[PDB]
Amino acid sequence: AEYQNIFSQVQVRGPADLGMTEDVNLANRSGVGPFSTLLGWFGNAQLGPIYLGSLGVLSLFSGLMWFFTIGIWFWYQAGWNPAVFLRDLFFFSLEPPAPEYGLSFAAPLKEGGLWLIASFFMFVAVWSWWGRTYLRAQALGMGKHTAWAFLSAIWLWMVLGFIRPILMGSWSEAVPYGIFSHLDWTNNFSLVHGNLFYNPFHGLSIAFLYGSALLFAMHGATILAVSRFGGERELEQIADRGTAAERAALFWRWTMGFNATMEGIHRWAIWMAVLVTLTGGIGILLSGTVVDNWYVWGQNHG
Amino acid sequence: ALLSFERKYRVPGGTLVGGNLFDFWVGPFYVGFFGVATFFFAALGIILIAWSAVLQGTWNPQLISVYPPALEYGLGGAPLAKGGLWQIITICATGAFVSWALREVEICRKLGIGYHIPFAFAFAILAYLTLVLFRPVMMGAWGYAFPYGIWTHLDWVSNTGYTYGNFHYNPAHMIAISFFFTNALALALHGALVLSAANPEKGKEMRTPDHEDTFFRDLVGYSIGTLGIHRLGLLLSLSAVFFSALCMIITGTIWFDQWVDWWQWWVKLPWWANIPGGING
Amino acid sequence: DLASLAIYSFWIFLAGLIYYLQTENMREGYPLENEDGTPAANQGPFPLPKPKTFILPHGRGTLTVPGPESEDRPIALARTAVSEGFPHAPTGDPMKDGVGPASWVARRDLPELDGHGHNKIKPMKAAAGFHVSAGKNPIGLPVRGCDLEIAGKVVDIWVDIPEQMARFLEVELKDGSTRLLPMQMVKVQSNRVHVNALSSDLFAGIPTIKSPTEVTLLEEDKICGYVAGGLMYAAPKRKS
Numbered sequence A: 001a002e003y004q005n006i007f008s009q010v011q012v013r014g015p016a017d018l019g020m021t022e023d024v025n026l027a028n029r030s031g032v033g034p035f036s037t038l039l040g041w042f043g044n045a046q047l048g049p050i051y052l053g054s055l056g057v058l059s060l061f062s063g064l065m066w067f068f069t070i071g072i073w074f075w076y077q078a079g080w081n082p083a084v085f086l087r088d089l090f091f092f093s094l095e096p097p098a099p100e101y102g103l104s105f106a107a108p109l110k111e112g113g114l115w116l117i118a119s120f121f122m123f124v125a126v127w128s129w130w131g132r133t134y135l136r137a138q139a140l141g142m143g144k145h146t147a148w149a150f151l152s153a154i155w156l157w158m159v160l161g162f163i164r165p166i167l168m169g170s171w172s173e174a175v176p177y178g179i180f181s182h183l184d185w186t187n188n189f190s191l192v193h194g195n196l197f198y199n200p201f202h203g204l205s206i207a208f209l210y211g212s213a214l215l216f217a218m219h220g221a222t223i224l225a226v227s228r229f230g231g232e233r234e235l236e237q238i239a240d241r242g243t244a245a246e247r248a249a250l251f252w253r254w255t256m257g258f259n260a261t262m263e264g265i266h267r268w269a270i271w272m273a274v275l276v277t278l279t280g281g282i283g284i285l286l287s288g289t290v291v292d293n294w295y296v297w298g299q300n301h302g
Numbered sequence B: 001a002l003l004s005f006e007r008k009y010r011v012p013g014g015t016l017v018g019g020n021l022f023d024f025w026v027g028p029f030y031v032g033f034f035g036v037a038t039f040f041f042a043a044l045g046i047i048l049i050a051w052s053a054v055l056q057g058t059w060n061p062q063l064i065s066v067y068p069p070a071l072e073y074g075l076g077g078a079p080l081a082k083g084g085l086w087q088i089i090t091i092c093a094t095g096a097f098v099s100w101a102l103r104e105v106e107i108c109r110k111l112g113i114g115y116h117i118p119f120a121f122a123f124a125i126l127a128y129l130t131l132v133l134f135r136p137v138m139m140g141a142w143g144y145a146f147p148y149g150i151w152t153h154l155d156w157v158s159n160t161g162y163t164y165g166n167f168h169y170n171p172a173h174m175i176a177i178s179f180f181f182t183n184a185l186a187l188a189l190h191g192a193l194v195l196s197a198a199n200p201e202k203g204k205e206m207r208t209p210d211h212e213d214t215f216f217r218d219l220v221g222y223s224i225g226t227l228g229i230h231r232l233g234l235l236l237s238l239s240a241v242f243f244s245a246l247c248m249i250i251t252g253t254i255w256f257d258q259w260v261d262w263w264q265w266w267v268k269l270p271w272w273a274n275i276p277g278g279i280n281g
Numbered sequence C: 001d002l003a004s005l006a007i008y009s010f011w012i013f014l015a016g017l018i019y020y021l022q023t024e025n026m027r028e029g030y031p032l033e034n035e036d037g038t039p040a041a042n043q044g045p046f047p048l049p050k051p052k053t054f055i056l057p058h059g060r061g062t063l064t065v066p067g068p069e070s071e072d073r074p075i076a077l078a079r080t081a082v083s084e085g086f087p088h089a090p091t092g093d094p095m096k097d098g099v100g101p102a103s104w105v106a107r108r109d110l111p112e113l114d115g116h117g118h119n120k121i122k123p124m125k126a127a128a129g130f131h132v133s134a135g136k137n138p139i140g141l142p143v144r145g146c147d148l149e150i151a152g153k154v155v156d157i158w159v160d161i162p163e164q165m166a167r168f169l170e171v172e173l174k175d176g177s178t179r180l181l182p183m184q185m186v187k188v189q190s191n192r193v194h195v196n197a198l199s200s201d202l203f204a205g206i207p208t209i210k211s212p213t214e215v216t217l218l219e220e221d222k223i224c225g226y227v228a229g230g231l232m233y234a235a236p237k238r239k240s
């Protein structure tokens, strides 16, 4: 049988690649991590370097704090018993204040205040991480598409934990930190708003989620199929169209009657993906604030 | 009718059936034997849906719905107006999809490219077939399949899910979801990264793939590379669907109770089942 | 009703997004042509976008698209029918002429360059200190084509420096010259490298490179197009 380019046949390695300098503060870059032959069957063998820096440290410390706040609470629920900890790991849950506290920071530690502390650390972890995606692109002179994309994920996140609770007038509306409990919250959210299948924004979010898998399956398969002409060297095919980019366009023109370009497929990609959490965040944000019951709304469109 | 670069590729050859008989295009579209098969299957299927619509007495696209046989018919035939149309339309659908994939193969062969695309598509077909064919058969009735209608297929998802409690607890479903979310994540990042290189800050030169690796190493300490990301997007999205099909083919067959109870196997493990405290003691 | 407004607005936004995306995707290959190369009458409902310019690194210039399109090479094909929509038969040897699945594009006759302005792809021997790190080392193996005859032997691997990956095998023929074979078109086995795309008599015809330690974008296109073309055009001498 023909080779399929799913896994490499032969790996090669040379000096650790320390990357491009441009305007990056090099004092803030680590050295190179190890080389993973395992990884290199599929992708790159090299680990690191990574860029540290002040924002980086803040974000990581903050993220750990969020993680350790939830896990401390979990140990407490476990009665400090390691065997109960593991047994009940997916059952534990750090839950937001009760409705009676509204938006106040007045809830007791054990009954909501700790949820707020974990949430506070999460907020600075994510935003400073967002700042990192902007700044690393800037230092390299690149466009800001990453940070613009990330912002669409942030939007659903912010709607769920922050903006929708504030508009609803209480932290009790927010999502609990737990494996099983976040899932129960999701089922409940839908039940209580008359079935999210009737929310047109949920249905769009689905079209886009499924569309992402359709599209990445299409694009990933297309590139692999023309990798025998260097198709995956996409930036150079943008600059100087090759037979890869042409055979790829024509596969699709002949199949379904239209096609993209090397650059433009990446625009279909970025939008198909960001539109998941946008549409999504809109549909959630409208739930309970403007529309109490999607089935009901859907009976009127109004 | 042709892209500026297109004529050199429009040579004869690559067909699987019929030699030169259907080796031609209509505008942009390649035909082939499977182009003809697709048209026949799709057309018959679409006609039968319009007939189903007449017998239902509606033309509204939001109301038209073609239902499989009621559970009492088991795995046998049903009068047209009562499940038979569904059954024929399903055969047409299947014919159309498999024909589409095989036309894609004819196209690959003419273009001298790999078969990755029709291979990927065959995952989607397999998933559709899981729901309309493999699962209904294993469960003993067509009536377990979803109906063809815009809102009624959603009623089916909701009803089917809530048959087993909160369907979130299906562990294969959890994996499938994880692949879907991760796929959208990787898609956003891939799109964004290429574009950020190709479209750099105002007045600067196009960044290189070395800048692409750099940005990702700077960000998270790793970069899968340009081959790797396309391998990845494919793996993630096919995995998502493999697990979707899995999660449903096991549901109503090997597992048919409330999915949340499946998780008890872990809590009830002898060495900790009876230690008090926590949530489950 | 605010949610009604939002949804109606969203669909207007999406119509505009799709128009934007489709027109972005027309920066290459348009305007559409008839089979004879002249502009087709029906260009469809989407108009070409305003051009944009990419600044290429390393003094290589710019690229503005959409721009005037032309093949910049002869296409040895002829019509097989008196009306539109049929295939075009090769007028000579389609492998030699570079049409059909053997097609190449007239890309720049310079090497792709890395972010430092060095040649992106080099023979491993000239790449300090790149080496095989996992898998069967193909260097030294006999190379077999789809006729099950030996065509030559692997004398090096050409690697992508910045991405640390194997791109071509360099294969020495009976006459002592070499050819590049794309990594994606070979099966490395324990005792041989196997090439399904070419019979052994087609190796000599693989397009040669002009300088023995670099390869240009144009040369990559010819080599790859030619090897892939063998799937269709070598099929008489295969045989598995």
Ligand code: BCL
Pocket: A197, A202, A203, A204, A206, A207, A208, A210, A211, A214, B046, B049, B128, B131, B146, B150, B151, B153, B154, B157
């Ligand atoms: C996949 C698991 C479940 C499922 C659960 C859901 C849920 C949940 C939702 C949908 C939604 C959709 N589903 Mg469904 N649905 C399934 C089976 C399918 C099948 C099939 C197997 O043949 C089809 C054609 C559809 C099609 C549809 C679309 C009407 C709608 C948007 C999908 C989308 O953008 O996808 C992504 C792919 C693209 C972006 C490509 C575009 C192709 C689409 C637009 C094709 C539509 C065809 C449709 C009108 C059929 C007409 C047939 C004609 C006779 C030819 N579903 C099974 C049973 N589906 C959403 C909706 O809003 O429904 C009202 C939604 O919330």
Ligand code: BCL
Pocket: A122, A126, A153, A154, A156, A157, A160, A185, A186, A187, A188, A189, A190, A195, A196, A197, A201, A202, A205, A206, A209, A276, A277, A279, A280, A281, A283, A284, B157, B181, B184
């Ligand atoms: C019983 C369940 C209800 C329902 C209730 C809900 C609810 C509630 C919601 C969804 C939402 C969604 N649903 Mg629904 N869902 C229903 C049934 C379906 C079905 C189906 C039946 O087949 C499908 C396919 C979907 C599909 C989807 C998605 C389209 C959408 C979420 C997209 C997303 O990427 O979010 C995942 C992405 C994020 C959550 C963003 C992540 C943000 C960033 C900032 C993450 C930071 C994390 C970091 C700190 C963690 C650190 C770890 C690191 C490794 C270090 N639903 C039924 C009817 N659905 C969401 C939505 O938008 O709805 C409109 C949502 O809120």
Ligand code: BCL
Pocket: A186, B097, B124, B125, B126, B127, B128, B130, B131, B156, B157, B158, B159, B160, B161, B162, B166, B167, B168, B173, B176, B177, B180, B240, B241, B243, B244, B245, B247, B248
């Ligand atoms: C109340 C409802 C239940 C629920 C009940 C179920 C049920 C029931 C099912 C799922 C399934 C899915 N659910 Mg669930 N699930 C819920 C909550 C969610 C949530 C969430 C965030 O809460 C999410 C993300 C999901 C996500 C998942 C996915 C893993 C999976 C659907 C994708 C898929 O099967 O693709 C597979 C893709 C296809 C089947 C499409 C194939 C179509 C191809 C071959 C061709 C179509 C072509 C043609 C007609 C197009 C027209 C041509 C035009 C020219 C365009 N569910 C809640 C708890 N879920 C489904 C699943 O796994 O199915 C296998 C499923 O059956």
Ligand SMILES: CC[C@H]1c2cc3[nH]c4c(c3C)C(=O)[C@H](C(=O)OC)c4c3nc(cc4[nH]c(cc(n2)[C@@H]1C)c(C(C)=O)c4C)[C@@H](C)[C@@H]3CCC(=O)OC/C=C(\C)CCC[C@H](C)CCC[C@H](C)CCCC(C)C
Pocket: A059, A060, A063, A064, A067, A125, A126, A127, A129, A130, A133, A146, A147, A149, A150, A151, A152, A153, A273, A274, A275, A276, A277, B181, B182, B184, B185, B188, B189, B192, B219, B220
């Ligand atoms: C547009 C929609 C899709 C999307 C987009 C998206 N997500 C993204 C990006 C974008 C483009 C960003 O660029 C950003 C990113 O950097 O990706 C690499 C991100 C991101 N999305 C992430 C996850 C994520 N995204 C979500 C999904 C989605 N993201 C959507 C499907 C989800 C889901 C589906 O629930 C998850 C969970 C992260 C990988 C990253 C944001 C990272 C972040 O905000 O960090 C904050 C917190 C920390 C930095 C540390 C947290 C603590 C950890 C639990 C500790 C364990 C590891 C630790 C790093 C070890 C270090 C120890 C040292 C002391 C040695």
Ligand SMILES: CC[C@H]1c2cc3[nH]c4c(c3C)C(=O)[C@H](C(=O)OC)c4c3nc(cc4[nH]c(cc(n2)[C@@H]1C)c(C(C)=O)c4C)[C@@H](C)[C@@H]3CCC(=O)OC/C=C(\C)CCC[C@H](C)CCC[C@H](C)CCCC(C)C
Pocket: A210, A211, A213, A214, A215, A217, A218, A221, A255, A256, B038, B041, B042, B045, B046, B089, B092, B093, B094, B096, B097, B100, B104, B117, B118, B120, B121, B123, B124, B147, B148, B149, B150, B153, B237, B238, B241
């Ligand atoms: C496997 C990963 C993902 C994936 C990949 C994938 N899909 C594929 C392919 C690939 C690689 C393409 O090659 C192929 C394509 O050409 O894309 C542009 C395709 C394709 N995926 C498509 C749709 C699609 N894919 C979906 C999902 C997925 N596809 C997965 C998530 C979905 C979802 C998520 O619901 C849909 C709706 C088409 C755009 C296309 C295949 C088009 C095709 O087969 O055309 C031939 C048949 C017709 C022209 C119509 C036939 C009409 C029927 C006979 C009657 C209708 C019956 C139907 C069952 C009724 C449904 C009613 C609904 C309301 C439920």
Ligand SMILES: COC(C)(C)C/C=C/C(C)=C/C=C/C(C)=C/C=C/C(C)=C/C=C\C=C(C)\C=C\C=C(/C)CC/C=C(\C)CCC=C(C)C
Pocket: A067, A068, A070, A071, A072, A074, A116, A119, A120, A122, A123, A157, A158, A159, A160, A161, A162, A175, A176, A177, A178, A179, A182
């Ligand atoms: C073994 O023991 C160790 C030490 C290792 C500890 C182990 C750790 C463990 C087991 C912890 C596991 C953590 C888990 C299970 C986390 C799961 C969280 C989930 C599933 C999150 C899901 C949704 C989260 C959302 C939507 C959160 C949204 C948050 C915001 C938008 C932030 C809002 C901020 C608020 C409310 C504060 C506002 C304050 C100001 C500044 C006004």
Ligand SMILES: COC1=C(OC)C(=O)C(C/C=C(/C)CCC=C(C)C)=C(C)C1=O
Pocket: A047, B185, B186, B187, B189, B190, B193, B212, B213, B216, B222, B223, B224, B225, B229
């Ligand atoms: C923009 O494209 C992307 C890459 O950037 C070049 C990546 O590298 C990755 C990261 C993928 C993996 C496998 C991380 C896990 C591997 C390790 C380090 C154990 C993703 C998702 C991606 O989208």
Ligand SMILES: CCCCCCCCCCCC[N+](C)(C)[O-]
Pocket: A030, A031, A032, A033, A034, A047, A048, A049, A050, B220, B221, B222
């Ligand atoms: C989401 C991907 C996560 C990647 C994990 C991070 C690996 C980079 C570690 C580099 C550390 C280098 N070191 C150990 C020599 O200092």
Ligand SMILES: CCCCCCCCCCCC[N+](C)(C)[O-]
Pocket: A007, A008, A009, A038, A039, A041, A042, A043, C135
């Ligand atoms: C995220 C990627 C993880 C990659 C792990 C996959 C390893 C599979 C290696 C298979 C290689 C087979 N072989 C020996 C022919 O090379």
Ligand SMILES: CCCCCCCCCCCC[N+](C)(C)[O-]
Pocket: A199, A200, A201, A202, A203, A204, A207, A211, A268, A271, A272, C018
């Ligand atoms: C990148 C653009 C691709 C656009 C895909 C659009 C899919 C349309 C699906 C209709 C959703 C139906 N509804 C009622 C939930 O809005």
Ligand SMILES: CCCCCCCCCCCC[N+](C)(C)[O-]
Pocket: A256, A257, A258, B001, B027, B028, C042, C043, C044, C045
């Ligand atoms: C959602 C279904 C829409 C399918 C989009 C594909 C349209 C391609 C039509 C090709 C016709 C080209 N033209 C006008 C030059 O003949």
Ligand SMILES: CCCCCCCCCCCC[N+](C)(C)[O-]
Pocket: A257, A258, A259, C018, C022, C043, C044, C045, C046
């Ligand atoms: C969200 C999917 C929408 C895809 C359909 C829109 C494009 C239709 C076909 C574009 C026309 C091709 N043409 C005539 C310019 O060659």
Ligand SMILES: [Fe+3]
Pocket: A219, A223, A234, A266, B190, B194, B230
């Ligand atoms: Fe790509």
